[PDB]
Design a protein around this ligand. Structure first.
Ligand SMILES: *[B]1(O[C][C][C][C][N+])O[C][C]O1
Ligand SMILES: [Ca+2]
Length: 223
């Protein structure tokens, strides 16, 4: 996250870190057994780390739970990142408490200008790189489909939304992928891609979670 602030410890209790030797992507806890993330974060083996603030220190709220099943969207396009969503079933159910909680799936698609919270352990620098130990947070609005498409001519599918600031300076970046965009307590976005990060007229692009409630419920019922 560039241009954000350090979250209060455990104030984003649905945020997970996906770990394969180190942190490599975020995800969102949506059920005690299920995490949603980006299909471009796919690996064969993933340890889900819940209840984190400092990913470099055992602070005493962590739950480390290996993935039992990792299911990418059947229409995920690894080139364009269309349908950039996957579901991780945990090998044991996460215990839900104040520090580890589910986030709601969306009732409807978010209106343009809805304020959201974006979080992750991704790059905090627009010039160079720095990877935080502590979970970072960014308040940002949903952008109009028109503004999104004018920033990325011909690249925005019906499964993508833009969230952020056209002026630059405030965005998700490398290592935030798969993590949450939450607006009024509902998961509306998954960190997916952008042309670099925090550039002028290149807002973050996010998987449009309000297209996937059927697929998510289908996948949970089947597995
Ligand atoms: B992701 O990339 C996220 C870039 C977001 C730009 N707005 O994170 C690790 C793998 O790709
Ligand atoms: Ca920790």
């Amino acid at each position: 996250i560039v241009g954000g602030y350090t979250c209060a410890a455990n104030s984003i209790p649905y945020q997970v870190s996906l770990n394969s030797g180190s942190h490599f992507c975020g995800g969102s806890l949506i059920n005690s057994q299920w995490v949603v993330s980006a299909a471009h974060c796919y690996k064969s083996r993933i340890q889900v780390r819940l209840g984190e603030h400092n990913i470099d220190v055992l602070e005493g709220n962590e739950q480390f739970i290996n993935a039992a099943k990792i299911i990418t969207h059947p229409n995920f396009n690894g080139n364009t990142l269309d349908n950039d969503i996957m579901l991780i079933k945990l090998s044991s159910p996460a215990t839900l408490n104040s520090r580890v909680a589910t986030v709601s799936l969306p009732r409807s698609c978010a209106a343009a200008g809805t304020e959201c919270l974006i979080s992750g352990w991704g790059n905090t620098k627009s010039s160079g790189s720095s990877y935080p130990s502590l979970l970072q947070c960014l308040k940002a609005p949903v952008l109009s489909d028109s503004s999104c498409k004018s920033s990325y001519p011909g690249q925005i599918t019906g499964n993508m939304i833009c969230v952020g600031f056209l002026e630059g300076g405030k965005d998700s970046c490398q290592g935030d992928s798969g993590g949450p965009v939450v607006c009024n307590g509902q998961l509306q976005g998954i960190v997916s891609w952008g042309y670099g990060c925090a550039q002028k007229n290149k807002p973050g692009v996010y998987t449009k979670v309000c297209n996937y409630v059927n697929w998510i419920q289908q996948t949970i019922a089947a597995n």
